[PDB]
Amino acid sequence: TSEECMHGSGENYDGKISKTMSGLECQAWDSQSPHAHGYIPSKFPNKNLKKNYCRNPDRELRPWCFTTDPNKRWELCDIPRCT
Ligand SMILES: NC[C@H]1CC[C@H](C(=O)O)CC1
Incomplete structure:
Protein backbone atom coordinates (compact mmCIF):
# COMPACT_ATOMS: atom_id res chain seq x y z
CA THR A 1 0.00 0.00 0.00
CA SER A 2 2.93 2.25 -0.96
CA GLU A 3 5.32 0.21 -3.08
CA GLU A 4 4.40 -3.41 -3.89
CA CYS A 5 7.55 -4.36 -5.88
CA MET A 6 10.96 -3.06 -4.83
CA HIS A 7 14.42 -2.45 -6.14
CA GLY A 8 15.73 -4.72 -3.37
CA SER A 9 15.66 -3.78 0.33
CA GLY A 10 12.22 -2.13 0.61
CA GLU A 11 13.24 0.84 2.75
CA ASN A 12 9.88 2.58 2.43
CA TYR A 13 8.03 -0.66 1.56
CA ASP A 14 4.67 -1.27 3.18
CA GLY A 15 3.19 -3.30 0.36
CA LYS A 16 1.14 -6.33 1.36
CA ILE A 17 3.70 -9.17 1.67
CA SER A 18 4.55 -10.39 5.16
CA LYS A 19 6.08 -13.84 4.63
CA THR A 20 9.49 -14.66 6.06
CA MET A 21 11.74 -16.02 3.30
CA SER A 22 12.55 -19.15 5.30
CA GLY A 23 9.61 -19.56 7.67
CA LEU A 24 6.21 -18.06 8.46
CA GLU A 25 3.65 -15.28 8.27
CA CYS A 26 4.98 -12.39 10.34
CA GLN A 27 3.63 -11.36 13.69
CA ASP A 69 7.18 -18.76 15.69
CA PRO A 70 7.80 -18.52 19.51
CA ASN A 71 11.56 -19.11 18.98
CA LYS A 72 12.26 -17.17 15.77
CA ARG A 73 12.29 -13.48 16.67
CA TRP A 74 13.12 -11.59 13.45
CA GLU A 75 13.31 -12.84 9.89
CA LEU A 76 13.89 -11.53 6.38
CA CYS A 77 10.81 -11.39 4.13
CA ASP A 78 10.89 -12.41 0.50
CA ILE A 79 9.56 -9.31 -1.20
CA PRO A 80 9.06 -9.21 -5.02
CA ARG A 81 11.75 -7.64 -7.15
CA CYS A 82 10.47 -5.09 -9.68
CA THR A 83 10.91 -6.96 -12.97
N1 LIG B 1 20.24 -7.57 11.80
C1 LIG B 1 19.22 -6.78 11.11
C2 LIG B 1 18.10 -6.35 12.10
C3 LIG B 1 17.14 -7.52 12.35
C4 LIG B 1 16.15 -7.31 13.51
C5 LIG B 1 16.86 -6.93 14.81
C6 LIG B 1 15.87 -6.76 16.00
O1 LIG B 1 15.01 -7.61 16.20
O2 LIG B 1 15.99 -5.81 16.76
C7 LIG B 1 17.62 -5.63 14.51
C8 LIG B 1 18.69 -5.91 13.45
Whole structure:
Protein backbone atom coordinates (compact mmCIF):
# COMPACT_ATOMS: atom_id res chain seq x y z
CA THR A 1 0.00 0.00 0.00
CA SER A 2 2.93 2.25 -0.96
CA GLU A 3 5.32 0.21 -3.08
CA GLU A 4 4.40 -3.41 -3.89
CA CYS A 5 7.55 -4.36 -5.88
CA MET A 6 10.96 -3.06 -4.83
CA HIS A 7 14.42 -2.45 -6.14
CA GLY A 8 15.73 -4.72 -3.37
CA SER A 9 15.66 -3.78 0.33
CA GLY A 10 12.22 -2.13 0.61
CA GLU A 11 13.24 0.84 2.75
CA ASN A 12 9.88 2.58 2.43
CA TYR A 13 8.03 -0.66 1.56
CA ASP A 14 4.67 -1.27 3.18
CA GLY A 15 3.19 -3.30 0.36
CA LYS A 16 1.14 -6.33 1.36
CA ILE A 17 3.70 -9.17 1.67
CA SER A 18 4.55 -10.39 5.16
CA LYS A 19 6.08 -13.84 4.63
CA THR A 20 9.49 -14.66 6.06
CA MET A 21 11.74 -16.02 3.30
CA SER A 22 12.55 -19.15 5.30
CA GLY A 23 9.61 -19.56 7.67
CA LEU A 24 6.21 -18.06 8.46
CA GLU A 25 3.65 -15.28 8.27
CA CYS A 26 4.98 -12.39 10.34
CA GLN A 27 3.63 -11.36 13.69
CA ALA A 28 2.41 -7.76 13.57
CA TRP A 29 4.54 -4.81 14.75
CA ASP A 30 2.00 -4.15 17.53
CA SER A 31 1.88 -6.20 20.78
CA GLN A 32 0.26 -9.60 20.80
CA SER A 33 2.34 -12.79 20.98
CA PRO A 34 4.84 -14.38 20.78
CA HIS A 35 6.46 -11.25 22.27
CA ALA A 36 6.08 -7.52 22.96
CA HIS A 37 9.20 -6.67 20.94
CA GLY A 38 10.69 -3.27 20.02
CA TYR A 39 9.83 -1.11 16.96
CA ILE A 40 6.37 -0.40 18.34
CA PRO A 41 4.12 1.78 16.06
CA SER A 42 2.92 3.70 19.13
CA LYS A 43 6.30 5.48 19.18
CA PHE A 44 6.35 6.35 15.46
CA PRO A 45 4.55 9.16 13.65
CA ASN A 46 7.02 7.97 10.98
CA LYS A 47 5.64 5.91 8.07
CA ASN A 48 7.51 2.80 9.18
CA LEU A 49 5.64 0.02 11.03
CA LYS A 50 2.21 -1.26 10.06
CA LYS A 51 0.36 -4.54 10.66
CA ASN A 52 2.82 -7.36 9.82
CA TYR A 53 4.06 -6.03 6.47
CA CYS A 54 7.85 -6.19 6.40
CA ARG A 55 9.86 -3.02 7.02
CA ASN A 56 13.49 -2.11 7.52
CA PRO A 57 13.93 -0.16 10.83
CA ASP A 58 17.69 -0.88 10.96
CA ARG A 59 17.70 -1.09 7.16
CA GLU A 60 18.86 -4.68 6.83
CA LEU A 61 19.52 -6.08 3.34
CA ARG A 62 16.14 -7.77 2.80
CA PRO A 63 13.13 -6.10 4.60
CA TRP A 64 12.05 -8.11 7.65
CA CYS A 65 9.40 -8.54 10.33
CA PHE A 66 8.96 -10.59 13.50
CA THR A 67 7.78 -14.17 12.98
CA THR A 68 4.84 -16.00 14.50
CA ASP A 69 7.18 -18.76 15.69
CA PRO A 70 7.80 -18.52 19.51
CA ASN A 71 11.56 -19.11 18.98
CA LYS A 72 12.26 -17.17 15.77
CA ARG A 73 12.29 -13.48 16.67
CA TRP A 74 13.12 -11.59 13.45
CA GLU A 75 13.31 -12.84 9.89
CA LEU A 76 13.89 -11.53 6.38
CA CYS A 77 10.81 -11.39 4.13
CA ASP A 78 10.89 -12.41 0.50
CA ILE A 79 9.56 -9.31 -1.20
CA PRO A 80 9.06 -9.21 -5.02
CA ARG A 81 11.75 -7.64 -7.15
CA CYS A 82 10.47 -5.09 -9.68
CA THR A 83 10.91 -6.96 -12.97
N1 LIG B 1 20.24 -7.57 11.80
C1 LIG B 1 19.22 -6.78 11.11
C2 LIG B 1 18.10 -6.35 12.10
C3 LIG B 1 17.14 -7.52 12.35
C4 LIG B 1 16.15 -7.31 13.51
C5 LIG B 1 16.86 -6.93 14.81
C6 LIG B 1 15.87 -6.76 16.00
O1 LIG B 1 15.01 -7.61 16.20
O2 LIG B 1 15.99 -5.81 16.76
C7 LIG B 1 17.62 -5.63 14.51
C8 LIG B 1 18.69 -5.91 13.45
